[PDB]
Design a protein around this ligand. Structure first.
Ligand code: APR
Length: 166
């Protein structure tokens, strides 16, 4: 009930400010799926994500980082670090779900008051950005969407999400 589902591609431009949340590996590889689509469009954000992975590696698990898209001041990117490696070496389902919860809790705390790269690029107060995501964990990471959906619903009354379905 804190989730609104919309049909369509999350990368089609929107008039309002938003944070695009997606699930990431800690290996500096936006290599497939939605992450690769972000790498094509937002190469400076990919650079930041790679830099954070190179510095902290899997110590990032259960954390998130907020990045400018740089190309559109109405679009930030929120990377949830939920697996050490991408592709077929991704972590087990319970690991990914636990880290998804922990990473979203850090996003929740940050909005209430992760944001190193926002300095000098964030146009609005962070609370003014809508929270949007594809069906994270359900593609390359192989987690049935209903299990991630239950994680999102743990934040009812704290955060609301718009989830895109192709
Ligand atoms: N523009 C898009 N718009 C809306 N939905 C999309 C889009 N692109 C993909 N999707 C949907 O989002 C689902 C999740 O996409 P994945 O990229 O497979 O994400 P995930 O399962 O969370 O795996 C994360 C892993 O893959 C890479 O994205 C990332 O580098 C990480 O290692 C996909 O199954 C797909 O159905």
């Amino acid at each position: 009930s804190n989730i609104t589902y919309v049909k369509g591609n999350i990368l089609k431009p929107k008039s309002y400010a938003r944070i695009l949340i997606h699930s990431c590996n800690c290996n500096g590889a936006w290599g497939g799926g939605i992450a690769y689509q972000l790498a094509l469009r937002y190469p400076k954000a990919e650079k930041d994500y790679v830099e954070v992975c190179e510095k902290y590696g899997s110590n990032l698990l259960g954390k998130c980082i907020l990045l400018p898209s740089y190309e559109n001041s109405d679009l930030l990117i929120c990377c949830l670090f939920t697996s050490s490696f991408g592709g077929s070496s991704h972590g087990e389902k319970q690991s990914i779900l636990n880290y998804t919860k922990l990473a979203l809790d850090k996003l929740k705390t940050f909005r209430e008051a992760i944001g190193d790269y926002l300095n000098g690029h964030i146009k609005y107060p962070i609370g003014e950005y809508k929270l949007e995501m594809p069906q994270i964990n359900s593609g390359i990471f192989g987690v049935p969407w209903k299990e991630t959906e239950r994680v999102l619903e743990e934040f009812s009354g704290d955060m609301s999400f718009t989830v895109y379905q192709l």
